[PDB]
From a paper:
Purine nucleoside phosphorylases (PNPs, EC 2.4.2.1) are cytosolic enzymes involved in the purine salvage pathway metabolism in most organisms. The enzyme degrades (2′-deoxy)nucleosides based on 6-oxopurines to the corresponding purine bases and (2-deoxy)ribose-1-phosphate. Purine nucleoside phosphorylase (PNP) is a well-known molecular target with potential therapeutic applications in the treatment of T-cell malignancies and/or bacterial/parasitic infections. The results are supported by a crystallographic study of eight enzyme-inhibitor complexes and by ADMET profiling in vitro and in vivo.
To obtain information on the binding pose and interacting residues, crystal structures of recombinant hPNP in complex with inhibitors 18c, 45b, 45q, 45i, and 45n were determined and refined to high resolution. All five inhibitors bind to hPNP in a similar way, i.e., through seven direct hydrogen bonds and four water-mediated hydrogen bonds as well as numerous hydrophobic interactions. The methoxy group at position C5 of phenyl moiety of 45b interacts with both Phe200 and Phe159 from molecule B. Bromide substitution at position C4 in 45q interacts with His257, Val260, and Leu261 of the helix (residues 257–267 are disordered in apoenzyme and form a helical structure, which elongates C-terminal helix upon substrate/inhibitor binding so this region will be referred to as helix), while central phenyl moiety interacts with Val260. Bromide substitution at position C4 of 45q leads to a 2–3-fold decrease in affinity toward hPNP. The presence of a bromide substituent that interacts with helix causes a shift in the position of the central phenyl moiety and the substituent points toward helix. No halogen bond interaction of bromine was detected in the crystal structure; the substitution pose however forces rearrangement of the His257 sidechain, whose position is disordered and cannot be unambiguously modeled based on the electron density map. Similar outcomes were observed for bromo-derivatives 45p–q , which exhibited similar cellular activity, with compound 45q being the most active from the series (CCRF-CEM IC50 = 9 nM).
Residue numbers in the entry: 4 to 285
Write the structure that this text describes.
């Protein structure tokens, strides 16, 4: 793992190298990377340049912290996030969330792409996360596993209240405020480890357990954020409808996820920029 002083060192280094003092951390899901373009007084740090900071395994598109202002909120954005299917243990995946805390961040916005399990959902829909099912966590893949540091939080923190009530209201409001043809979905995100896509039998399992969307991220970051006392809001871009019957002759693919990512780009960047106004000042 990391010692408390590895995080302190990373935080202080970043404070020594930017005048930016962020209040909101935003983790961009696959196809919301553009959102760093909306920042003003943007200062970029490649992960490779930051002490202790896991480096990306995707040489094609690498990973950056961008400090800057979004809609008059002091932000730090992660463009390129870590997943456990890449081989990172969860203490590396969620390492940034503890750095954010020590930078003085008090709010985390997490976005992801996800497959629709709720049949009412359509490709392009945004689902606000009311709740999650942490399948890896049940089995021992929980990012708080190991010694607990009281300087971060309690041994046994609650997650029943993980996704801020207030921010979810203010999000539904903001959505009405802009009108929009399709309605804003709300529901349960189930994390699976991946990286392979679900069988029909697996899809039926996740439906039966009461999940509306399934993806391979987000939940560990949420747990570590909550363990710190960060306010947490997030959502899923529904990129694909999960094949739930053997009669179907369609299959889930990387391309159709990326393509949905490119389509609903503006809408999500637009939505997240306006939501900054709805985040309390410190
Ligand atoms: O049907 C599905 N089952 C299980 N998982 C998924 C995901 S998750 C994903 C799949 C492909 C690419 Br390309 C990117 C990501 C997200 C990455 P993230 O950082 O946004 O979470 C999308 N659809 C499904």
């Amino acid at each position: 793992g990391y010692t408390y002083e590895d995080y302190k060192n990373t935080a202080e280094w970043l404070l020594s190298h930017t005048k930016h003092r962020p209040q909101v951390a935003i983790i961009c899901g696959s196809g919301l990377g553009g959102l760093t373009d909306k920042l003003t007084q943007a200062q970029i740090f490649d992960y490779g340049e930051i002490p202790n900071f896991p480096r990306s395994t995707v040489p094609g598109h690498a990973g950056r912290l961008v400090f800057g202002f979004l809609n008059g909120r002091a932000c730090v954005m992660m463009q390129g996030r870590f997943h456990m299917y890449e081989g990172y243990p969860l203490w590396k995946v969620t390492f940034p969330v503890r750095v954010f805390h020590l930078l003085g961040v008090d709010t985390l916005v997490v976005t992801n792409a996800a497959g629709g399990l709720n049949p009412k959902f359509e490709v392009g829909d945004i689902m606000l996360i009311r709740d999650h099912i942490n399948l890896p966590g049940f089995s021992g893949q929980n990012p708080l596993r190991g010694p607990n540091d009281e300087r971060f939080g309690d041994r046994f923190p609650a997650m029943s209240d993980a996704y801020d009530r207030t921010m979810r209201q203010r999000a539904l409001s903001t959505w009405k405020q802009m009108g929009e043809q399709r309605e804003l979905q709300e529901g349960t995100y189930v994390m699976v480890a991946g990286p392979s896509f679900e069988t029909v039998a697996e899809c039926r399992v996740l439906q039966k357990l009461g999940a509306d969307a399934v993806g391979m991220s987000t939940v560990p970051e949420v747990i570590v954020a909550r363990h710190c006392g960060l306010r947490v809001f997030g959502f899923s871009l529904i990129t694909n409808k999960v094949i739930m019957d053997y009669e179907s002759l369609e299959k889930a693919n990387h391309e159709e996820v990326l393509a949905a990512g490119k389509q609903a780009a503006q809408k999500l960047e637009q939505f997240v920029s306006i939501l900054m106004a709805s985040i309390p000042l410190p």
